[PDB]
Every structure is written in structure tokens, then in C-alpha cells.
């Protein structure tokens, strides 16, 4: 493959894909079982990006709060008013 013809991953596509993965894990984490690693995945996203939930799936944050799946330490209102995980994922790929 000529160097000039190399493919690459663009910021908009991968941000979109990562948000979809997060949304799927959030949904799976609210319907309860442990065959799914979903609760561990959502907790890890929340702790790593310092967020809890998605503004596209706002009602689901009520289950995150009752299962203690938001970042440890954080208060209830601060999971409500801080930026959501989609915004944090955008900032990761944009370098902000």
C-alpha cells in the first residue's frame, strides 16, 4: 500500500462509536445480571472520564445513582449538573 493511500481513523467516527458502546453498557447495567460485565464497564467509564450517564438516556442515571455506579465521592447534584459522558468522550478525542 502506497503511503499516500493509507487509511486512518477520524475523530468524528471513533467518538460516535465509543458513545454507542457506552450507551449499550449503560442500558445493560440497568437490567440486572452479572453475566454482563456491564456494571463494571459503566463504573470504569464514569471513574475514568468523571461523568455519570448520557443526556440522550437521562432517565437511566436514576438507576446509576441507586446502584452507586457514578464516580466514587461525587454527590447527587454533581452527577446532574456536571457534563455527561458523551461530552467527555468528545473532549477526549478533540484533546480539550
Curated annotation (Swiss-Prot):
<comment type="similarity">
    <text>Belongs to the tetraspanin (TM4SF) family.</text>
</comment>
<feature type="site" description="Important for interaction with integrin">
    <location>
        <position position="11"/>
    </location>
</feature>
<feature type="disulfide bond">
    <location>
        <begin position="51"/>
        <end position="85"/>
    </location>
</feature>
<feature type="disulfide bond">
    <location>
        <begin position="52"/>
        <end position="70"/>
    </location>
</feature>
<protein>
    <recommendedName>
        <fullName>CD81 protein</fullName>
    </recommendedName>
</protein>
<feature type="site" description="Important for interaction with integrin">
    <location>
        <position position="39"/>
    </location>
</feature>
<comment type="function">
    <text>Structural component of specialized membrane microdomains known as tetraspanin-enriched microdomains (TERMs), which act as platforms for receptor clustering and signaling. Essential for trafficking and compartmentalization of CD19 receptor on the surface of activated B cells. Upon initial encounter with microbial pathogens, enables the assembly of CD19-CR2/CD21 and B cell receptor (BCR) complexes at signaling TERMs, lowering the threshold dose of antigen required to trigger B cell clonal expansion and antibody production.</text>
</comment>
<feature type="topological domain" description="Extracellular">
    <location>
        <begin position="8"/>
        <end position="96"/>
    </location>
</feature>
<comment type="subunit">
    <text>Homodimer. Part of a complex composed of CD19, CR2/CD21, CD81 and IFITM1/CD225 in the membrane of mature B cells. Interacts (via the second extracellular domain) with CD19; this interaction is initiated early during biosynthesis in the ER and enables trafficking of only properly folded CD19. Part of a complex that includes MHC class II/HLA-DR molecules and IFITM1. Interacts with IFITM1. Interacts with IFITM2 and IFITM3. Part of integrin-tetraspanin complex composed of CD9, CD81, beta-1 and beta-2 integrins in the membrane of monocyte/macrophages.</text>
</comment>
<feature type="site" description="Important for interaction with integrin">
    <location>
        <position position="43"/>
    </location>
</feature>
